């Protein structure tokens, strides 16, 4: 059901 693409920070630079 849950996939990482839908996380708020999925495409945020961790730096």
């Amino acid at each position, epitope marked *: 059901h849950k996939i990482g*693409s839908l996380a708020e920070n999925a495409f945020s630079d961790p730096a």
Partner: antibody
Amino acid sequence: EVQLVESGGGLVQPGGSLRLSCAASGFTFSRYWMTWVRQAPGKGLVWVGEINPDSSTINYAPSVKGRFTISRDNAKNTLYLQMNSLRAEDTAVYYCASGVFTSWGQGTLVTVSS
Amino acid sequence: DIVMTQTPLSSPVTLGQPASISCRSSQSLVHRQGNTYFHWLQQRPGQPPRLLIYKVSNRFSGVPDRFSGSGAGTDFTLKISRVEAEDVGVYYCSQSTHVPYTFGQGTKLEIKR
């Protein structure tokens, strides 16, 4: 500087087991999903799976389901890939990545050979 | 699983000229009623891949303006406008709309000199 330092690779016999580690610094690891991707020598990228921050969701590629286990230890900022029943077709460089590919480890080569 | 199809080699592109790389997906990459999780990655030899464009057209950190993305549904294109020598490498398309996430086979950019 974000760092993702991998370890545990090397030679393993077919049918055997190996555990890879990916240690993170420079960001709040406990807030990110983490991802494994692999690349056989001379071939393309293949997704292995992902794990959410609290480990309540773990998604796997069909090619590894039931043989590989992804886990993490947020207290040690470390992601793990436990591989069992390894076959030659599993030979590859294994990469970890944050989120959906937003920062990458250097890769560690696993060679499955007798 | 969703199949991503791209060609293995680009036409030789001259320095300072544009290159285009296309990818087709076997089904729509629109997630339910929201975003299109289609991305482009760049890989140089001996190096890990790097995210270049995410969600069709968004440049990732440190990605300069000569890289742009377009497309919709099942057809997408990366344009590299004014190719530089450092842009040599392999460019992968990717979908993360559904698990397992999948990648194209990789298109190698060849520079004509």
